[PDB]
Structure 1
Amino acid sequence: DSVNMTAFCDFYIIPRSEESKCTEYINNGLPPIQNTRNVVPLSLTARDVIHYRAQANEDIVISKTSLWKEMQYNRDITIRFKFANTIIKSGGLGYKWSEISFKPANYQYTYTRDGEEVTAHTTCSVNGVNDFSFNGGSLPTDFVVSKFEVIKENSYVYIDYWDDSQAFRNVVYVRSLAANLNSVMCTGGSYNFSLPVGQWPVLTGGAVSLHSAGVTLSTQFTDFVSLNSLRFRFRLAVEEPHFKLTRTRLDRLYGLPAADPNNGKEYYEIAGRFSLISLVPSNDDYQTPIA
Structure 2
Amino acid sequence: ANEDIVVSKTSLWKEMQYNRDITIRFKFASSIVKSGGLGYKWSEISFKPANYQYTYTRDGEEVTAHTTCSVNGMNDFNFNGGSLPTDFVISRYEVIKENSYVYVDYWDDSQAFRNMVYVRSLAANLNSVICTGGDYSFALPVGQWPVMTGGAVSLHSAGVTLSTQFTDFVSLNSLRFRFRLTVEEPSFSITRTRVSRLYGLPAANPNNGKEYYEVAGRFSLISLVPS
Q: TM-score, normalised by structure 2?
A: 0.86
Residue number in structure 2 paired with 1:210: 155
| Cα-Cα RMSD | 2.5
Residue identity over aligned pairs, in percent, reads 89
Alpha-carbon distance in 1 for matches of 2:18, 2:137: 48
Residue number in structure 2 paired with 1:197: 142
Aligned-pair distance for 1:263? 2.6
CA distance 1:231–1:130, shift in 2 (3 Å): same
Tell me if 1:97 matches 2:70. no
Tell me if 1:150 matches 2:95. yes
Tell me if 1:79 matches 2:24. yes
The secondary structure found in structure 2 opposite 1:231 is strand
Residue number in structure 2 paired with 1:140: 85
Q: TM-score, normalised by structure 1?
A: 0.69
Alpha-carbon distance in 2 for matches of 1:240, 1:58: 58
Tell me if 1:187 matches 2:141. no
- Say whether the 8 Å CA contact 2:14–2:224 is kept in structure 1: yes
Residue number in structure 1 paired with 2:206: 261
Residue 208 of structure 2 aligns to which amino acid in structure 1? Answer: N
The secondary structure found in structure 1 opposite 2:19 is strand
Alpha-carbon distance in 2 for matches of 1:183, 1:142: 40
- Whichever structure has more strand as a proportion of its residues is 2
Tell me if 1:277 matches 2:213. no
Q: How many residues align?
A: 227
Residue number in structure 1 paired with 2:113: 168
Aligned-pair distance for 1:105? 2.4
Task: Please list every run of 5 or more consecutive structure 2 residues that lacks an aligned counterpart in the other structure.
Answer: none
CA distance 1:261–1:273, shift in 2 (3 Å): same
Alpha-carbon distance in 2 for matches of 1:155, 1:175: 28
- Say whether the 8 Å CA contact 1:245–1:252 is kept in structure 2: no
CA distance 1:117–1:229, shift in 2 (3 Å): closer
Residue 118 of structure 2 aligns to which amino acid in structure 1? Answer: Y
The secondary structure found in structure 1 opposite 2:104 is strand
Structure index of larger Rg: 1
Task: Please list every run of 5 or more consecutive structure 1 residues that lacks an aligned counterpart in the other structure.
Answer: 1-53, 285-291
Residue number in structure 1 paired with 2:177: 232
